[model samples]
Target: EEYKDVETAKKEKEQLGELMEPALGYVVKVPVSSFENKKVDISDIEVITNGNLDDVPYKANSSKYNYPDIKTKDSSLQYVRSGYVIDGEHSGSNEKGYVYYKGNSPAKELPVNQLLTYTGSWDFTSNANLNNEEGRPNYLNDDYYTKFIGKRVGLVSGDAKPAKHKYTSQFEVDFATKKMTGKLSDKEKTIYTVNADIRGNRFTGAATASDKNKGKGESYNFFSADSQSLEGGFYGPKAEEMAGKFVANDKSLFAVFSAKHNGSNVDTVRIIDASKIDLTNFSISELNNFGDASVLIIDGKKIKLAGSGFTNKHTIEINGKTMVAVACCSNLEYMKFGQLWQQAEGGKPENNSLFLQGERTATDKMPKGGNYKYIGTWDAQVSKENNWVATADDDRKAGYRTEFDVDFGNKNLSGKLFDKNGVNPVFTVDPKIDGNGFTGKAKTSDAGFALDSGSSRYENVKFNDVAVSGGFYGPTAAELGGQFHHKSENGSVGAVFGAKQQVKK
Candidate 1:
């Protein structure tokens, strides 16, 4: 009876026509099965391979088929197993069906125990379903053993006829604790907070309004008083992307977000010749205070180096490679110049050699004949010491919103660094534009406040000698950013500002 059964199965298989051309990189002589009489085309088939089958042999008696070896275009042989079959109606074709392959894995795996940051855009909706329609913990088999940090800026409500409010948000995911936390903020302050529990590749959370009383700044809260639920899932073969949807209990508020992993290994170092750098825009006193015989340039502006010393003849070595040590000058904002020292083997020693680094923008692409306005933020450090200046310290940090107005045609720039309240101007910017750069003095405005005993109070404090240096950024000078240093009998302040061009109506 077993022999007869085998003979009958062989005869039935032979009756079907042989597989046709367009084998989709599959080996020939592979039997092609069909549903009804329709043949399976390339579009109807999905091939999923878990690494190379040559190294991982297929197990006997396994449901996966070994026939029809798959020869990928990359010249690798793989094994494919038939996954789920989709009905013709669901496949978008009433006459043809499709099959999915089951065993494919991502070529790259996500790192574990590392905090990865992701940056992306977000949009809001009004018709979001809070219920778990698709079920939670999807893709449980996939590995998610690490943590993630992410941020989304410039969020707009898609359901609105015209989005009136913009928002920003930051979130964190911890696999070890199986939890997720997030906060949403407007330009001014945080409005909502989220807490969720992670289940496999999916997370479910709740969102609460930061302020309970609606009378105080109620207009900023988009959701109702009722509780809200949030649902999200990890995507991509290696979970490189993620998305989430949120909805209030009464469905009054809804938002969706999508983001991709921003890899941690970003290369910020650049190598350049020292002879092509320029620092004439800075004062001699500033260079003298920089690192021992060294001027470190960051983000296209020169600053005093905090540590390490260099002599003219000493060659600077980084990562086992010796770099050029000649200082040159230019108008590019992203250029970095510095001097370092490495002793010479012989008696002859060269002194005071300089080096330049960072990317440089071409002059032809610079913006011309346009009046532009930029609005952004500024961070500063206020110290009691007369000449003390370094990167902003947490103990003495101060920041606020800032605005800049530029006239490329007339080569003029004016801006205001606002006080901590973000209301009144503290410093008025009147910089002289030179090429793609600007250098001028920052003067205390009538609205300036005085710093007394680590506290700032409203007062008309008049002071000068605040040096400003910065340059245009982007291909068409679409953005403006720069730094300022102020010193006086009261104190010293070092600040930086970055702003984007405002669109004209």
Candidate 2:
């Protein structure tokens, strides 16, 4: 019987699972070149000639710029008003490129018109060229355009469908170049192109750009070679629309023109929403912030803070930087609030940290039983930073995160936590749990505003995370800020001032 079994066991190899076409992907990283460009603040394109900055401050009316009343102890502190410089950049690229005739080939291919995902990143080396930031709006209007130079703007608009239909390009740049390569210098270019056409759109279009010097060999092409598959149906942009775009054939085009009035090479690039551009190999400008935006701040602290401005999805705008996120999405269920806080530079002003408080507001709302974050609360503390995942756990579905830094050496973090959740304020200030025994009450501030009375709880004195010999430590650092509030009022009205303490565990 054993001999029969051995003879019956014929040599056989597992067949490779049904073969499939390898995911077709291509990347074209363009290197940096003559990227310096001159910019001018023309008084009025409609005016006689290119003009100068109209610094005429003759207005004294009710403008949004007018100060708002704060009414602090000092009258001067009551109203906050200031006119400072902001940056609004538009670029003109004489150098343009793209990856045309992309995507799976038809007839012999599988799922020919399938949408291919795409991810792109560029590193630009911006030279000493003035950018139209917010100083003077327009040369004619004094407050139209910004008077700054060179701002690095990242593009992540997943429109899904490129300029052509029946074709989809999906790219998983899931991992960031900086997060991976850590600021590589191997390449010194900012222009990048990634494309794959799934549709059979015909096109006689091509990538183009405008030059300031009129004819100083001022042109570079990086896109479109007659792809009849994508014919006139996908007419790529022409020369005039290179620097800027017109919205829906409207005369009100968000003009982004390049001029040589100041004797500089400034490429103005602007695209209105709903506008399509063949963005194959558009000449990119590497940011000057480390010689490139590709340069990451590995040692930088990370601050991540989920927020809600009443909108399930919100935007936290700090200084000028912005982060778009779902208020309740980053709940403790998966990610901890502290982790979100890490996305920002070190928070807490008392630490003499180099960061500032930001404002939060929702541009969109969430679904039912989803989130209830309000405006001005969906804010994050941001500053290109990085920090070790101080403390993290993958056990609880409602995860928890906390940093292990020492407490304020001499500063007293005494605070009152009034949770409307009715849960006894298990908060403590005593270094050890027993030192300041947990004894407190909370209340519902918005009990009248869709919140109930028991919503609020107040703890007289909270304890610190400093483990005590036998006493229970206070609500161990940040563990208290549950991603989703326990009590209706807790989530609705968040912690009041002087209601939070963070003594690293």
Candidate 3:
């Protein structure tokens, strides 16, 4: 394993010019696996003498060393250099050149296990089963789908700059050759194809995902820009799937999505087909006389709301309780509401945002219905069941603990999302609540340890090291589970986080 010649090669690498050689002479051999399924030949890896990594030797002794550098097709290759003939006694034949090349690894193909993964479920026969597991049309086998592979999300540009939109992205990966065919779209309409590459967990590439913006609509048609960058990492719950943020058009913000699932974040923001919903069923009169309704359904998920729902330019009351008007505009020419809205603190209306106590309605479609309560902003729960004992499951922050309080009244939550024992804090999270869930970006505070074991305290380490998202449901409370990301001294780390509802012990 140790080579003095290679040691000298490194020491004098800079000293020698082109055609330079390593000390003690050097050699590298090609492994059988390198050529397993490759169409490459030994000639492709042209070897030079006088210097191991040398392009061309300075000496003109070409004819003297013209034998098979590596046997035509022999794996057990041998090379005996015409050694120094001292007193007519040449060096031993066993003292041959070292065997191998530099830079590229020996294996040409990734392992088969790394190839298989959960793909997009667009093959579903009916729209009703689109988000369900049972409706999968046909399993992905050796046959290729001829379309993009995984379901993804990312920010996109419009016809101009500073003006951007969000869209879903997908890809078709050929693990055998490590080739990728990625695509971006809105409501199943193809926006453009992109060039990309995959290496283990990380992926990076670019695409010109735009054309002349002739139509002005609520979807990607809103953006006039065309060029964008695509890069993000997917985690392995089971190499079957992963989720990560993808940045487009070099924007500061990124979009998020899972590989094979949809509507995973209905309460915050999501895409719905405009052509699919029955527009006749929506009642504009309901907005005028929006009164006491126990449960209202939007995109299928149900939550008890206290001050959440929609009214056109006015406020709605539930069971004699008035709710704030949600601030948003949709192409449907109608008003909608949820745990999302805006404000005029003193009275200047704020821009539309995903307010923690409020969310949104099915902008382009119909929603499943059920009984619900009106939730409000800053609404705290009187019941003790809302308290939770939180734990960070990542090994880098294993013993992480925090006090979590739920305010079902506003569909919002606030508390320590990351901490140590209880005294020292890391990051505070008060995310907007969606249907039975909460998700938001959290950052490291002024002072905290970078490790899960409670060591190496770092200060002012600027980085958005936390990405929290997931859902927890049930009247009594069970457990809240989701994925998270951390940036330590080593690099990026990711894991599943859990918080179990608890009582005073």
Which lDDT values do the candidates have, in the order given?
0.40, 0.18, 0.29
Taking every candidate in turn, the Cα RMSD to the unseen true structure, in Å, is: 28.5, 24.7, 30.2
Q: How much does candidate 3 score in TM-score? A: 0.22
Per-residue CA lDDT of model 2 for 1-505, tens digit only, reads 1011011121132221211111111111111123253321111111111111122111221122223211112122111111111111224432111111111111111111222122121111111213333121112122113222122211111111222211111121111110100111112422212212221111111111111121111121111111111111111121110011101111111111110011123222111001001111111111101111111111121223333421133335544444332222222211112111112333332211111111111111111121111111111111111111112222122222121111232211222222222233222222211121222233322221222233334322212232211111112212122111111212211121101122111
For model 2, the local distance difference test gives 0.18
User: Which of candidates 1 and 3 is the stronger one according to TM-score?
Assistant: 1
lDDT, model 1, position 12: 14
TM-score of each: 0.29, 0.17, 0.22
Predicted candidate 1 versus true structure: per-residue lDDT over 1-505, tens digit per residue: 1011001111111121121111111110111222342221122211122323232122221223322222112121122222111111111122111112121221111233345443333344222111232111222112211111000111113212223344555667554455667766654566677777743344567778777743312132334343445655544334455555554465343444444555555322111112211222221221111111124432223333222221122244444534334221112233333332334444343332223332212245666678877665544444452211112111112445567888988989999876554356777789777665678888775544555425444343565767776766434565556666555555556555555566644
C-alpha positional error of residue 242 in candidate 2 after TM-score superposition, expressed in Å: 18
Residue 452 in model 1: lDDT? 49
Question: What TM-score should be assigned to candidate 1?
Answer: 0.29
